[PDB]
Amino acid sequence: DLGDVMEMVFSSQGCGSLFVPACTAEGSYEEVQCFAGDCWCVDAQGRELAGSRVRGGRPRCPTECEKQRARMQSLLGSQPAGSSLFVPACTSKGNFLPVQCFNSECYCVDTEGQPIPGTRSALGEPKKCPSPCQLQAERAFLGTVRTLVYIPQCSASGQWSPVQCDGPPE
Amino acid sequence: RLPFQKLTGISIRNKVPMSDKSISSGFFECERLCDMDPCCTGFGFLNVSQLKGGEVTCLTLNSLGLQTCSEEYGGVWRILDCGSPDTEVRTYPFGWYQKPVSPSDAPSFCPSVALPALTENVALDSWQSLALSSVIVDPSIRNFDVAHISTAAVGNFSAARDRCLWECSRHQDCLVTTLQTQPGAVRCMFYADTQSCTHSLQAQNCRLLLHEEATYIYRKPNIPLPGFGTSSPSVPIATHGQLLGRSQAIQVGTSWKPVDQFLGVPYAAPPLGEKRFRAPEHLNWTGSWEATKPRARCWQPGIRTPTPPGVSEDCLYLNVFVPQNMPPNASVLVFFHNAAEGKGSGDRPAVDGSFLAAVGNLIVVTASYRTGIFGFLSSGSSELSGNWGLLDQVVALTWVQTHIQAFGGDPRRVTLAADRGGADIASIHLVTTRAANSRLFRRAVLMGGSALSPAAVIRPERARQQAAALAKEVGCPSSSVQEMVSCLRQEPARILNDAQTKLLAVSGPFHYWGPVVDGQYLRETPARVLQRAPRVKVDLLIGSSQDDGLINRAKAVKQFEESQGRTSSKTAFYQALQNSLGGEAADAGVQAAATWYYSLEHDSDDXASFSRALEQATRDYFIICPVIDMASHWARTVRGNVFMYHAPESYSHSSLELLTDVLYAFGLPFYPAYEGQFTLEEKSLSLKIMQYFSNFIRSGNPNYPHEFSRRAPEFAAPWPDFVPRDGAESYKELSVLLPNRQGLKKADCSFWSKYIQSLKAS
Amino acid sequence: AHFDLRSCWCVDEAGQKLCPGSCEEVKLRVLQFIREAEEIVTYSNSSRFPLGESFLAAKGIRLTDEELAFPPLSPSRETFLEKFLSGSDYAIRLAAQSTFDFYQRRLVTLAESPRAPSPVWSSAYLPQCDAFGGWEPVQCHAATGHCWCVDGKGEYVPTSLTARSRQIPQCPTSCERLRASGLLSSWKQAGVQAEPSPKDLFIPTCLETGEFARLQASEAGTWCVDPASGEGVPPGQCPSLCEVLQSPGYSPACRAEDGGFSPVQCDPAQGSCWCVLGSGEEVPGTRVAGSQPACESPQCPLPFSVADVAGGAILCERASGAAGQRCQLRCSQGYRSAFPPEPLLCSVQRRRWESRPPQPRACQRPQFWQTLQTQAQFQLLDYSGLLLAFQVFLLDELTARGFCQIQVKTAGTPVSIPVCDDSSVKVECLSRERLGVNITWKLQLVDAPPASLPDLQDVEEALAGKYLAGRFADLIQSGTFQLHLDSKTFSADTSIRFLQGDRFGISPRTQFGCLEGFGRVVAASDASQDALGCVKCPEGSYFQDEQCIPCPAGFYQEQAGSLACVPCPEGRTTVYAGAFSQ
Amino acid sequence: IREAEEIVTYSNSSRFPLGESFLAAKGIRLTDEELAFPPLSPSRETFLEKFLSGSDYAIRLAAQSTFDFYQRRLVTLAESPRAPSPVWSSAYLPQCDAFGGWEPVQCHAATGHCW
Amino acid sequence: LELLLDEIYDTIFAGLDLASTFAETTLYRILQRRFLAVQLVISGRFRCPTKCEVERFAATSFRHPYVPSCHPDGEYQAAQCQQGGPCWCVDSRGQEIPGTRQRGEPPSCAEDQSCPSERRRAFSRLRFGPSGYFSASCPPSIKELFLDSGIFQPMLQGRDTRFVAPESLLKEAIRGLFPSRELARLALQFTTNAKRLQQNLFGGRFLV
Ligand SMILES: *[C@@H]1O[C@H](CO)[C@@H](O[C@@H]2O[C@H](CO)[C@@H](O[C@@H]3O[C@H](CO)[C@@H](O)[C@H](O)[C@@H]3O)[C@H](O)[C@H]2NC(C)=O)[C@H](O)[C@H]1NC(C)=O
Ligand SMILES: *[C@@H]1O[C@H](CO[C@@H]2O[C@@H](C)[C@@H](O)[C@@H](O)[C@@H]2O)[C@@H](O[C@@H]2O[C@H](CO)[C@@H](O)[C@H](O)[C@H]2NC(C)=O)[C@H](O)[C@H]1NC(C)=O
Ligand SMILES: *[C@@H]1O[C@H](CO)[C@@H](O[C@@H]2O[C@H](CO)[C@@H](O)[C@H](O)[C@H]2NC(C)=O)[C@H](O)[C@H]1NC(C)=O
Ligand SMILES: *[C@@H]1O[C@H](CO)[C@@H](O)[C@H](O)[C@H]1NC(C)=O
Ligand SMILES: *[C@@H]1O[C@H](CO)[C@@H](O)[C@H](O)[C@H]1NC(C)=O
Ligand SMILES: *[C@@H]1O[C@H](CO)[C@@H](O)[C@H](O)[C@H]1NC(C)=O
Ligand SMILES: *[C@@H]1O[C@H](CO)[C@@H](O)[C@H](O)[C@H]1NC(C)=O
């Protein structure tokens, strides 16, 4: 029926030899697909993303920060001139930067890019953020607690301790 | 309830009036009356005597006979019995009802009933039986009709087959009959033309399209028209006599098709002497006209000084190309073209329509017409109105309307086509009220020209100035129009053509002749006419070539100028730049804006670079952007379906004067005269493009060969509609991959159509 | 002069130095591909190459023989490396093909535990050619069940592709294709081939068998053509196909009456002497590899006023001496006898068939295997009662828990393949309180979606894997299968066994079969050898029990693939068995 | 080096087909279930992961194991042409001090390069 | 709904002959479309409730342990659940799919799963061999006719509004306005310009 035609055209937006897709044990697309020396990232429906393809290598697929950054930057292109909308900053490996700022207000954020309470300050006032070992440690005290319902060890100063131990926390 | 509204050869068991009851009660009784009769196979509950108001009636039947006139079928094409106005069987719950189909027959005591025998026999040998491999099932087929025959109303299948083959033989538009056995009946399906061919470089394989599978398929062979059948066809022309043509074998791939050719058919009296600069007149010819050789071609600017044998003022002839054994009422292409020959021989036309006619399964007409001064000399007034060559095209189109049936074409399926200059000239027919009131054509193919061109029409005062300049050049007086016409009518054609070539040079006066608003054929300029609401729908296929341009179009004039001893001096550069973008086309501001935009250097001496920049500037202004403007206007105002192409730049065949779009659309890679000059990829590309253009001529859509079938094209990618909105504006690129692209020349055409058209509006 | 004093070879149309017909030339490339893929397996068992060298070739780096200082060997590194330096689709198919074959052999040799080897007729597609190197109009791929039509030069014919249909499609020969197109559209053939006039154009005339007729005509005149191809102009009152060939390895000896191939052909060198058809193709089962192969025609006439056997012919021995003239029905290539093999005996002297008369309509078209079947056995834990009630009750319980459907994890909507019927469950009483239950899942291949289960191997594993049989073995081994029957409970034992061809094993094996109206012609055991195992029961026949049995005397059947024989009217009968009309 | 010598080890006792590394270089790997291949101690996965990532590491690994396979063979079958390479001409090995730190001078014997 | 007939207009879209049944008249079609527009304003959907939504409403009213869960377009969700009970997967009719009864987690109801079928098709294409005709992608002609032409894109997005239509609203609207291809073909026969279409379909400017 004509409703089916509307669904088929809607599905066909963004549509396209000896390529063999790689699947997971659960039957979902493996998020990295490779053919003839190229490799790219795919979504749930197994469609290639625009900038994923890398020759002679294996790409790192987009993270949370990188996807938010690419989403907030497609809406800063609708704001008026001389106007600021927040845009998160991401490291080269996809992680969030420790400090995020917006209209001269700055926060420490965790690995999910959420403000850490008690860390706000003004732009230009240096702020001491918790170390990356302290954050992944905390973030894993509740990885454990959730499952009952190793967590990371931090040498003095918050620098990762060269020896790391497994098991329940102590 | 049967879907069929008309039953033929029924057998009635009882008739019961039901007018003293509710419609619900009468239906309930009619059902139980057929229940009580062991021989009843169904009943009718209907109004009889509907012309006197109708009477509710129950008719019990022991045979339903031949069931026709289904409401589901016969929508576009009906051939069987329909429309009985004294009976009402449509409104719920009226209808013919069947007892449920069971393989257990009626009691043995029931009367034997059979359809009445046919009055005359059916040969079976005048019918071609087709295998299932020769057909394609296409559920989008719509031009078909259905009948059902009760399985108890015919003794055996042979009786059912002869009844259904007899129905088709009575209707001349029925070409195919199929029979299929259902549990309760024999289903007969009748088709019009549904042929579908696969074209390749090896062999041309053609099949029939059917709505559904069937077991037996019978086709009626095509019978040639009265004068056809041999290799010397002789077509009767009403009020004239016989027209004698030739027959030619045409090769595409490894297949051969015979095409009948009628070359040099007059459509008007030769415009000589007092008929020069006059409206075309009827030619009274009788007896047999020999139409086996191409005739002379019209005078054009730049004809070589040793006059070729095929140049004459006697040039109002058309050529007809008719493939053999077509289905009735073929579509017709009328292509207007004057050849700038020097390669075409005296036995072969320069544009052979045989290959497009054979591949497209249609009739091609190529016609010549007066151009230049001979076709458009005007004083800007009723004394010498002008438009003589436009009236030639009207007369030639009227001839097709009068005479094409005799060759086998439908006068209602005509497409008008022209290329380069003629496309600008032939687009005037789209804005004249007479051409629409006559219905001279249904579709248009404009190849490199538009009615929105800046040079489409000449202003009346420029025509008076240009007429005087030609009078001055040949020695005639300009004091009076009647005096000047008389002296120009005694001149030799060679003398008049040398004068017009001299005055036509762009580095000189740029005196080009074209249509003028006269107040008879052309009542107002094309821009005003297109602002009005459309009256009739015309499908438009339009495009352009990157190899087109004013200098390319005037290379013969340039060659003449050099032979006369006139080179590119500095004032030649000056006139070339002013004349190109000016002459009602620019004030001092438009010239400066275009100079900036195209980096045109007025005071250079490099004719090469200056010509390249100017040709890029004038191609957009005069050719490409007017084409896009016309396609946008035609789509925005719903004047018809719009399809646009663009032929990208070529370097391969500069010796041929035809551009890329005409060479592919007419199949020149298949011409025997050019064997060894085209690659197999150009042949394959040309064959695909001929299928696009044939489809548009036949159905008004380059994707479909039939109006009543919507099966997706397989020879190439589909060609999208032209939608006049930013982000859309798709076109077909005529390259090897035939891709679809969006927004041709968007930046350059914005400059001309928005910025420049606003500089000229102030 | 055409003198021979130099080396010769065969060449393409454009001078490629590679005589074979079109189909046979394409066929030789696929045979080369298989041989190379098996060479890769050969070199992979006797270690002559490092494992990472093909990876290096795929990256464009090859180590030359001088810098390795490697003395050349007979299987030179160059032979293997060239296959992989060109990173073409040919090399990818070659690497894939040799990769399965290496592992499937190993798995089998080390321990053939998990499952059965693939049928040897599921392989790369091999073009099917006629007796003279041309393309057969029907092309089929057994591994997928796909069949399609090709034209005279092997090009696919549009929208002719079919998948797993009961009947293999009919494809016109080149003559019939050219004639039908010529009649519809007047796209004709040229008689003179250089500057033809419209009177030199002709529509080919075809024999009813699909061959070009010897004499083709236009208005310019008539001429002779090769029956197997209209090319024609045979300049040797038209030469017969043999006579065209006479001036196939050895040149055939042919009969003087018309030029038809003599019934006995021979190889002058090899000792094989055999029989041929009227066409000249060999009868499949007649190579005698000795003098006087039995090529004689019978003296006894055919049973029901029929002119000749359709597919094959009745080839007898020499006139016997007492009057037996022992004969046998041999079907042509591309045909199988629907009914089992029979010896026929003729009375030269009565002049009537002493044995059962031969069946004129026996030879039919074989079809692919149509069904797949697996069988398991479990036990339900009184007698001398009607157990056929329990057959319905068990089927209902199997249906309720979804063991009579296959669910295929497609993209959107999932198709359900029914794998049961009323004959699926058979129960036998073994001992008190323990019933014996047989469950048989039969999949019809016409229902298996070709888009979700492309190969017949994919169909086998869907029927004998985690969605049907592996999921049912776990349910039985657990102990949670009980049947509710008037408050009484019948729990099933934990033991389950699978049929494996007369040896109940612990793993399910599939078995190929035919549909309802189709008789088996290939034994069950060698179904791995031959893919065409099903023939439709002909017009003189009915179907019972996997065999096609001829209508007995007094009965007639007119439509093929029927389940019974219509009796003659009470006043009439049939003189012989296998009557096929009213 | 240990992985490159494992490749040579698996290349003498034939546990893998010759064209499977080529297949991995093209992105196609055959999963263990569809091969119906019962897992072995040198699992196909250990070898295949090295070659599915078409990185420079795999190219060096395939090259290094390719010379070592042929140089052993040439020697064992017939050590006719020339001498085996000095065993101190190999991949560059970082030179460390007694406490795991870098020695300020680093040298590569196979090329005579120091930095 | 009580629909008043006093102020409804007349329309151009119509057949040549008067319909056989009342269900085939323009009178029924106008009443049906007005009903659907009111449904859109009072329920969010240009349609009537689906089978899933009716059963979900009845389960919530009588407080049944198993409440069916529905997508916003009316379809059954693949994963169904009972209150503190087992979970399972269902088909489009809402009937449990055999062999999918999980206990704790919302089941791995196979939604997309185009990979294993795609992977099988690629292997059968590899195994076909070197030469011969073979056994996310665009359906034929759809991209060229609908998306290359730029026909579909103005339909999807709002004009002078930031409102973006869901796919369900577009599928519901086309089903509600044109129940069949033959009725849509009738509308094209008698609609010259698209500014008149709503007035013909609804017997007035109803949507405003
Ligand atoms: C089938 O035939 C029956 C009987 O002839 C038709 O019923 C008749 O229909 C007419 C007009 O529809 C009725 O006539 C009168 O019309 C005037 C209008 O001027 C009205 O004021 C009266 O009240 C009355 O309706 C007539 O009464 C009626 N007869 C019966 C017995 O119902 C019927 O219309 C026909 N059906 C079809 C589909 O043509
Ligand atoms: C409020 O509605 C009335 C009624 O309009 C009719 O019913 C609507 C549901 C819709 O289908 C309209 O197209 C119908 O015409 C409007 O009154 C009508 O206004 C038009 C144009 O102004 C006029 O031609 C009619 O004669 C009016 N009919 C009546 C009965 O008054 C009214 O304009 C609407 N109010 C607003 C603010 O739009
Ligand atoms: C259940 O299945 C088994 C296996 O097919 C059947 O046992 C076969 O029975 C036939 C006929 O009696 C014998 O010819 C075979 O030799 C038997 N095979 C084996 C392995 O025993 C058994 O008859 C079936 N039971 C029922 C009730 O159908
Ligand atoms: C079919 O019926 C007709 C009816 O007269 C008659 O020719 C004969 O009985 C039948 N013919 C054939 C050919 O079956
Ligand atoms: C052609 O069309 C006309 C009108 O549509 C029709 O009357 C005629 O029968 C058709 N066929 C021929 C051969 O004229
Ligand atoms: C490898 O070759 C040996 C003989 O050298 C043979 O015994 C063995 O079966 C072969 N293995 C295969 C072919 O897998
Ligand atoms: C391969 O292994 C065998 C023992 O299995 C050994 O004798 C031989 O030298 C080896 N070849 C090499 C390492 O090249």
Numbering used by the authors:
A (entry chain B): 594 to 609, 614 to 746, 759 to 779
B (entry chain A): 1969 to 2730
C (entry chain A): 892 to 909, 922 to 1139, 1145 to 1155, 1164 to 1237, 1241 to 1300, 1310 to 1510
D (entry chain B): 937 to 1051
E (entry chain B): 250 to 384, 406 to 478
Sentences from the paper on this structure:
Thyroglobulin (Tg) is a 660 kDa (2 × 330 kDa) homodimeric protein which is the most highly expressed protein in the thyroid gland. The protein is secreted by thyrocytes into the thyroid follicle lumen where, upon iodination by thyroid peroxidase, Tg functions as a scaffold protein for thyroid hormonogenesis and as a storage protein for both thyroid hormones and iodide. An oxidative coupling reaction in which a diiodotyrosine (DIT) acceptor receives (via a covalent quinol-ether linkage) the iodophenolic ring of a neighboring DIT donor results in the formation of thyroxine at an acceptor site and dehydroalanine at the corresponding donor site. Tg is a homodimeric protein packed with multiple Tg type 1 (Tg1) repeating structural motifs.
Here, a three-dimensional cryoEM reconstruction of bovine thyroglobulin at an overall resolution of 2.6 Å is presented. In this report, we present a high-resolution structure of purified Tg (iodinated in vivo with normal iodide content) from the bovine thyroid gland. We have been able to definitively identify three (of 70) tyrosine side chains per Tg monomer that are modified either to diiodotyrosine or thyroxine (Tyr24 and Tyr2575, indicative of acceptor sites). In addition, we observe four tyrosines with no discernible side chain despite well defined main-chain density, which we have tentatively assigned as dehydroalanines (Tyr89, Tyr149, Tyr1395 and Tyr2542); these are the only identifiable candidates as donors in thyroid hormone formation. Nevertheless, two acceptor–donor pairs were clearly identified in the structure, involving Tyr24 (acceptor)–Tyr149 (donor) and Tyr2542 (donor)–Tyr2575 (acceptor). Our high-resolution cryoEM map and model provide clear structural evidence for Tyr24–Tyr149 and Tyr2575–Tyr2542 functioning as acceptor–donor pairs. Both thyroxine acceptor sites at Tyr24 and Tyr2575 exhibited extra densities in the cryoEM map, revealing two phenolic rings coupled together, forming T4 at the site of the acceptor tyrosine. In contrast, Tyr149 exhibited no side-chain density in the cryoEM map, likely indicating the conversion of Tyr149 to dehydro­alanine. The distance between the Tyr24–Tyr149 acceptor–donor pair is 27.4 Å (Cα–Cα) in our structure in which thyroxine has already been formed. The second iodotyrosyl coupling site, where the donor Tyr2542 and the acceptor Tyr2575 are located, depicts a similar mechanism in reverse. When compared with the non-iodinated human Tg cryoEM structure, the α-helix with Tyr2542 has been slightly unwound and rotated, resulting in a 7 Å shift from its relative position in non-iodinated Tg, effectively creating the binding pocket for T4 at Tyr2575.
